[PDB]
Amino acid sequence: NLIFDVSPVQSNEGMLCAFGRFGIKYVNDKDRILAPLIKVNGELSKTTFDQALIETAKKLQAIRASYGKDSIAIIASQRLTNEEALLLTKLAQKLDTTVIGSFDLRESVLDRIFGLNA
Amino acid sequence: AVTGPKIAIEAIAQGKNAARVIDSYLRGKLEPIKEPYYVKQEDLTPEDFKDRERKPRVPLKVANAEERKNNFREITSTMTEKEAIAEASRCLECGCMDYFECQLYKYVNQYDVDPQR
Numbered sequence: 001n002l003i004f005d006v007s008p009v010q011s012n013e014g015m016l017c018a019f020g021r022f023g024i025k026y027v028n029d030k031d032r033i034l035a036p037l038i039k040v041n042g043e044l045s046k047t048t049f050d051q052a053l054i055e056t057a058k059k060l061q062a063i064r065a066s067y068g069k070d071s072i073a074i075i076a077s078q079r080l081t082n083e084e085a086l087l088l089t090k091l092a093q094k095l096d097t098t099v100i101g102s103f104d105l106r107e108s109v110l111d112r113i114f115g116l117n118a
Numbered sequence: 119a120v121t122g123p124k125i126a127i128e129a130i131a132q133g134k135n136a137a138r139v140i141d142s143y144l145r146g147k148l149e150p151i152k153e154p155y156y157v158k159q160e161d162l163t164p165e166d167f168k169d170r171e172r173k174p175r176v177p178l179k180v181a182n183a184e185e186r187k188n189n190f191r192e193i194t195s196t197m198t199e200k201e202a203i204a205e206a207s208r209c210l211e212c213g214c215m216d217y218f219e220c221q222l223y224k225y226v227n228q229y230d231v232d233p234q235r
């Protein structure tokens with residue numbers, strides 16, 4: 001369950017940079033969290049996945065109830081796969097919010113000129 | 119659907135009785151539910167138990183109101199095995215010890231008795 005090395009493929013210049021070659025070290029990091037945390041007595045404590053997910057759903061639903069539409073922001077990392085991003089959009093749709101974005105997301109200008117930001 | 123809003127154990131009782139009647143009907147011998155006759159003691163008053171040692175009930179653990187009003191977590195906790203055994207040991211064993219083999223009970227339930235006269 002440990003990563004020991006990384007090799008570039010022999011495709012085009014067969015090159016990786018410092019990130020792609022050496023930043024995979026976070027996979028073996030001992031500081032990775034493996035269990036969820038919920039706030040009991042005002043401090044984060046370990047719990048089970050079912051309890052944490054139920055707590056998350058109830059917290060988001062309570063916010064939506066007491067504050068209405070577009071009251072929850074879903075800020076997602078751009079390293080997630082396409083399926084996870086699409087599922088997050090569907091979750092925003094079910095949570096009754098259009099505020100889904102990223103803090104790393106640059107302002108778009110190509111969709112105003114050519115049609116697609118691509 | 120039949121009795122209107124009640125508690126859940128009433129619905130479970132209705133479902134079990136209906137299952138019994140349906141099982142009888144599926145055999146072509148539809149039988150209504152018959153209530154057995156039990157001998158009871160309605161004359162018992164507290165001084166009949168004045169010699170028993172008094173023991174406290176198992177305390178019920180309740181989550182703090184301030185923290186619990188903000189979440190949907192369970193309010194009460196399940197008791198421990200020690201507390202369970204100590205609480206079960208408080209029972210006075212009111213039922214007859216021969217209930218499952220008493221021939222008098224069996225016979226008075228085989229014949230429709232009206233013993234109050």
Ligand code: SF4
Nearest residue numbers: 208209210211212213
């Ligand atoms: S048999 Fe035990 S539980 Fe039942 S009424 Fe008597 S003391 Fe209570």
